[PDB]
Symmetry: D2
Subunit: 345 residues, 4 copies
């Protein structure tokens, strides 16, 4: 009754399939999906052994989502049919201390209740239609291009959160290091320019990507090679960086992060590369904080979208069809996407 992209066999690839069109239960909303982002966390999931995977088969993929409100469920009010909306992804219980703050990303009782985001447990966005649990997980778009902006629901939000979190320890005139100019990283760079006073240093591996980073306003773009630590030291007295945003998060990049963060600095480990930064005396410098943030707050999403409208940040997009989505995943794992892959069905 509708088409969708699903993960169905452990270790297998994602398939386009036919499945029922869902109806909105009470309190719920269904969207006609205008755009759908592909994130490298979607990759990480599909290469897990059968034992570590916990989202059930089948699973409709894709947790960056925008659309137009197709049908309203029982009792729902707040949004009309026809409204352009983005999906706030990191769903939570709505009532705990964090949720009440808007920070459903840090919900203290969601693992317990088995609340899961769309595309990471609940039916996701890579489909012609998707359901959203509740009205508070929708954010108005007005007249922002869904394709241009949908990726801000994660690729923007997540580093924005991490950056906004870091401005306490990142004074204007400071220096910030972004490791990885990928989907998040390339937005991370723009955001850092928009709202910190920092001198942004980007690091990636392909020159392709360094040029993009520099084009997106990075004051410096460097290879994350064995000379990277030295150059950053050079560029910052011998003081190091006030903030470091590791959007790779592997043991190598984390090691780099430790060796360059300044006294009293901060490291946001944003990417999931399987590493851990050993934080402590004579490991991390004095006053140096370390954190593995996760996604962002409800308000923070609205703030990122408001920045898009202002023209202070954008997603570099590479467009695909619903059918091309499996190919786009192969491109993403190959590392030959420029920015964000966005599927339009």
């Amino acid at each position: 009754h509708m088409r969708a992209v699903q993960y169905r066999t452990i270790g297998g690839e994602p398939e386009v399939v036919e499945v029922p069109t869902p109806e909105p239960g009470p309190g719920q909303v269904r969207l006609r999906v205008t755009a759908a982002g592909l994130c490298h966390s979607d990759s990480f999931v599909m290469g897990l052994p059968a034992d570590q995977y916990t989202y059930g088969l089948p699973l409709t993929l894709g947790h960056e989502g925008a659309g137009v409100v197709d049908a309203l469920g029982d009792g729902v009010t707040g949004v009309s049919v026809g409204d352009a909306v983005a999906v706030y992804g990191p769903w939570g219980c709505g009532q705990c201390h964090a949720c009440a703050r808007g920070a459903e990303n840090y919900c203290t009782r969601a693992a317990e209740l088995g609340i899961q985001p769309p595309g990471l447990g609940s039916p996701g966005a890579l489909a012609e239609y998707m359901l959203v649990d509740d009205v508070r997980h929708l954010v108005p778009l007005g007249d922002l291009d869904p394709v241009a902006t949908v990726s801000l629901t994660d690729a923007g939000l997540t580093p924005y959160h991490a950056i906004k979190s870091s401005l306490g320890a990142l004074p204007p005139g400071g220096t910030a290091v972004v490791i990885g100019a990928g989907g998040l990283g390339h937005v991370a760079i723009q955001l850092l320019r928009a709202i910190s006073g920092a001198t942004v240093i980007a690091l990636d591996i392909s020159d392709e990507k360094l040029q993009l980073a520099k084009e997106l306003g990075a004051h410096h773009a460097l290879r994350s090679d064995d000379d990277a630590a030295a150059r950053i030291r050079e560029l910052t007295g011998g003081v190091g960086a006030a903030a470091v945003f590791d959007i790779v998060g592997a043991q190598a990049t984390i090691d780099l992060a430790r060796s360059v963060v300044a006294i009293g600095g901060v490291v946001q480990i944003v990417g999931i590369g399987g590493g851990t930064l050993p934080t402590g005396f004579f490991s991390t410098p004095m006053g140096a904080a370390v954190r593995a943030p996760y996604w962002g707050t409800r308000t923070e999403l609205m703030e990122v979208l408001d920045l898009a409208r202002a023209g202070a940040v954008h997603v570099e997009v590479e467009r695909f069809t619903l059918d091309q989505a499996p190919e786009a995943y192969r491109r993403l794992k190959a590392g030959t996407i420029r920015g964000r892959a966005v599927v339009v069905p």
Copy 2:
């Protein structure tokens, strides 16, 4: 020409000795020492191999210091002879971004210039007289008992700093875990009660010390045994603690710290136990920050002293003479001091 307590042979014990009385150079001040604190960092130094030790022999010990201003050096103004003052210990360059903020503890150029605190590089406080480099490293006492308060220069300041740093992520009504109710820990407990809204949980090993902790306003005092993680979980939904202050900082206590900090929480690794908390995804929880703070800011010292005057915090003191100082160090390493050892010469 005056008596003092010094460290002179690697691996040896501290000796009372006769040495010259120092004169204040230009910009400097000499104090007639009214009280002098003994900290377990003084211990840590003296058990280092010859290669890792870098403060020179001989070294006058003691970095908690108060007194009356004996003689003024050339050109000095700001304080008169006769003024009761405490010593702000973590000396810095005075001009960098941190120093200008008052945070000479996080001075970016002090290792370079070879600036060292009194008792950890420069002549310390365990003497009849000591020199202070500059007037900005003195804080008025008015009429606070030097013996009662001197330890607030470190035993208070350091956890105060760490606590004040944590209140962002420690909401009133939250829960805070203090591992170690020693010199710092027993002040840490009082401070947490004074200025957080938290339910303080203390952890130590002797029942002696738990009783003191509970007497000093800890809502709970627990053994840091293998049931400690469970009890903390029990006491906090299954949510864990918003803040954890490890005043031991060994690999065991750090492991405990990781297993009990809440989603979005913070761990201040205050003690130097040789461990490191492996911070990262699936190691630390989501949003969980980790930090190894060091001492505190100039303003923060004045704030702690203002709390003493208000009667909102005190040091439990165990008094000694200059001659008894070697014995007091043995007691401290034995772990049979109640609070802080303060020498009066």
Copy 3:
């Protein structure tokens, strides 16, 4: 079909009346009311001319509310019948930037939509039953006495908000002035002791109330007479107070507030006494901020309730019956309530 306290004639007194028992529409909840607070804002409303009054006649009064969940409306989930809950009063649209943050008190689109709190536009709490618009405006009590705590929904929340807002400019060891030790003021005092490091100075007019203030932990209790400014100056060098909380907010108390706030200080004008503080150069001191806060955030309510459970704050209550409510209002305007008047039906 049920009894309630209502305001029905402009310039008239509140009457106990019989009215229909309400049923919960979809998304709504009905409570069996266990306790109901009386606030001096309820007074302010009833002495307005016909033209300035805008809540309609009749109006069920009372915006401090607790109870047990009687009946669930269509589609509602989140809370069961039988759950002990408090009402978060300052209702908002739920979707704007403020609301998403939890700060429905500062909702940017609520005047437009005509959203009104219970007891200040919607049917209130002084009844055997009341309706709440949505589940997010309920907060679990667990096993807190509804009578002991209900007033924390406003009498606690409002000054807590104002205090928490002020801690940026109120360092531990500072001085805070609370003008008015009434319903809010007497909780304000306790909160200031719980979570600031401040030396609290209370000011009222009856010695009755000063004694209560001092009993509740005020370091000083003074008459708000013509010597009040002088004494505060005396007590704080000649520096004045870092924070001032005017819980009266009349032109006299506001004038006092201006003349005693310190350089870089803050004034929270909490009470509605018809005055305005003229903020500006050579009126307010340099760096001195001034604000008229309103109520508090959703999370902030939960935080205050968590403080009650911890035993760090309580409401001094004076109990009444539903029938005695008109008399209790007369007592409140007469200024001969000790703390908060709470009606139990």
Copy 4:
């Protein structure tokens, strides 16, 4: 023995005069002045009646100052002869809580001690040489053009301070209104773009100045006429601005400020136009804070200078000679300076 610009007769104009070249006392430094800013506060002073003026005659003017260190005073170390430095102007006692923080602008004991800034009490910068009281009031320039940057010591610092102070209540994607695009205002605009996520709205009276404002990155430039309030309302839903920076501060501009600040917003009254914003219930909106900041912190100066080096902000300068300084003051009061008047002797 050297030339200087002085104010010598009440109600009279500033004269170029010959006076002794000063020698540095102990702790002091003398600068060979490379550039010297002219601020409209220099104007405000000279039009005061004899009774309200308190800086003595004669007075060397000019409180924006840069130079090269000519001669060192007794005992001074920290800076060598030949070092390029800027002067941190708002001198304070160095020891109080504020000063220790770096915030000598909010020094609690400076009026008492009669400490006065250069150009506003002490010999100023409009001379061939000037003295600075102490080394901590100098900030390294490295190789920034003194003429290009000197005005950042006030024209930058002051609004930077006010802006940095406001970012709590100014979320990215918000809207900020800068009233007055003059000396401060034109830097204010750039700073707001550098480090807030805000949509900047500038307001001035000459189209000349609006064009400059828009050229300097203002998203909108409007006449501060009777339609100004309406347009701002239009541009921001009907919500108003999160932040408003009144760099005029007259009763008219303050009235505008009140009528456009949003619920929960902030107004920084930066300019000295003789007005006062009546802050209170039904005057200012709910949660709306109001403040008259003064200058900035020591660290904040270094941060602004670091932004200059980064190329994120600059002063639009109009250069003059020492002799032309009286004419430049006439131009400034006439309102026909474009940016900042900087004298080079």
